[PDB]
Design a protein around this ligand. Structure first.
Ligand code: 0PI
Ligand code: CA
Ligand code: CA
Ligand code: CA
Ligand code: CA
Ligand code: ZN
Length: 316
């Protein structure tokens, strides 16, 4: 759309008011011209045909219930863009300011969200297992981060490399949640999962076993479902990343924490310089150690915490 940049206001999934960047040309579109080559939000209208219609509104106010998921997908994709630019110096997912596109209201009662190879897609949930998925900042950033991986290491979505792929998505979604300081935690999806139950989440980084995911390499899933457990074995990496950041004793192995910012810097450098499509857990270990070496010196505390962390979850 070609028009005039403006600012509208709306209410998100959780009922929070926010301002969003729109474009005015007869109608007000969910098109933010302020970030790279733009952030574009589409209405999939309960269908599975993508992307749908660029979101159009007559008055620049987005308070209707149907507007909610579009408001949050558009706003949270701006926050994620900003985290990447400001913290890591990366312009959009490809590093060259590629336009960011998201479609909301995909299908009916759809309990998931995904990156399709070219855009983000968000279901509305069935109302009991999930509310509309874009209402979770860690969900949004998990999604955008799959594009980032796809453009960098290119981790294949199966087995070890696939669980590394999921872990990256969960680690950076959690980092963007602390960046925005939106009630941050080390849990995944808590703001949109099981609206009737408090205190739970989809996955836990601090304690993956809380929901039955492995927290040690010896407990890895070796089967076939879930593309070889990409959403299951990511718990072993998630726990390692939580130990590097926060510290603790796990299975008798003690880790001194080095904090979230260093965790983000070592993981991004491993992702952009050292990992390949077929990297496995032991290679991720070498890549994180090398990153931390590059950045802080071989004899630093940083490098020592990365080794301890991996030794705690049984990786090498
Ligand atoms: C019950 C689900 C939420 C758990 C799970 N999905 C997830 O953990 C998150 C959403 C969470 C963060 C809200 O979704 P993912 O981004 O990992 C689902 N992605 C996914 O399956 O991607 C594969 C793909 C490749 C090309 C084209 C289409 C799709 C799963 O698909 O198993
Ligand atoms: Ca309106
Ligand atoms: Ca939270
Ligand atoms: Ca969270
Ligand atoms: Ca819940
Ligand atoms: Zn994922």
């Amino acid at each position: 759309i070609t028009g005039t940049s403006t600012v509208g206001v709306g209410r998100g999934v959780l009922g929070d008011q926010k301002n969003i960047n729109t474009t005015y040309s007869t109608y007000y579109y969910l098109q933010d011209n302020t970030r790279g080559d733009g952030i574009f939000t589409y209405d999939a209208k309960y269908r599975t045909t993508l992307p749908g219609s660029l979101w159009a509104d007559a008055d620049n106010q987005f308070f209707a219930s149907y507007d909610a998921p579009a408001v949050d997908a558009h706003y949270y994709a701006g926050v994620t863009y900003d985290y990447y630019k400001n913290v890591h110096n990366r312009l959009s997912y490809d590093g060259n300011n590629a336009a960011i596109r998201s479609s909301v209201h995909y299908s009916q009662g759809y309990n998931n969200a995904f990156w399709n190879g070219s855009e983000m897609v968000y279901g509305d949930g069935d109302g009991q297992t999930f509310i509309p998925l874009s209402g979770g900042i860690d969900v949004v950033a998990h999604e955008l981060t799959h594009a980032v991986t796809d453009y960098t290491a290119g981790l294949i979505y199966q087995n070890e490399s696939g669980a590394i792929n999921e872990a990256i998505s969960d680690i950076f979604g959690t980092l963007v949640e602390f960046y925005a300081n939106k009630n941050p935690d080390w849990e995944i999806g808590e703001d949109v999962y099981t609206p009737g139950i408090s205190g739970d989440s989809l996955r836990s980084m601090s304690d993956p076993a809380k929901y039955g995911d492995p927290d040690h390499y010896s407990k890895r899933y070796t089967g076939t479902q879930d593309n070889g457990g990409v959403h299951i074995n990511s718990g072993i990496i998630n726990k390692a990343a939580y130990l590097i950041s926060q510290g603790g004793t796990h299975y008798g192995v003690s880790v001194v924490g080095i904090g979230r910012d260093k965790l983000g810097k070592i993981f991004y450098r491993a992702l952009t310089q050292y990992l390949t499509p077929t990297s496995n857990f032991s290679q991720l270990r070498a890549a994180a150690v090398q990153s931390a070496t590059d950045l802080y010196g071989s004899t630093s505390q940083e490098v020592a915490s990365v080794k301890q962390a991996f030794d705690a979850v049984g990786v090498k």
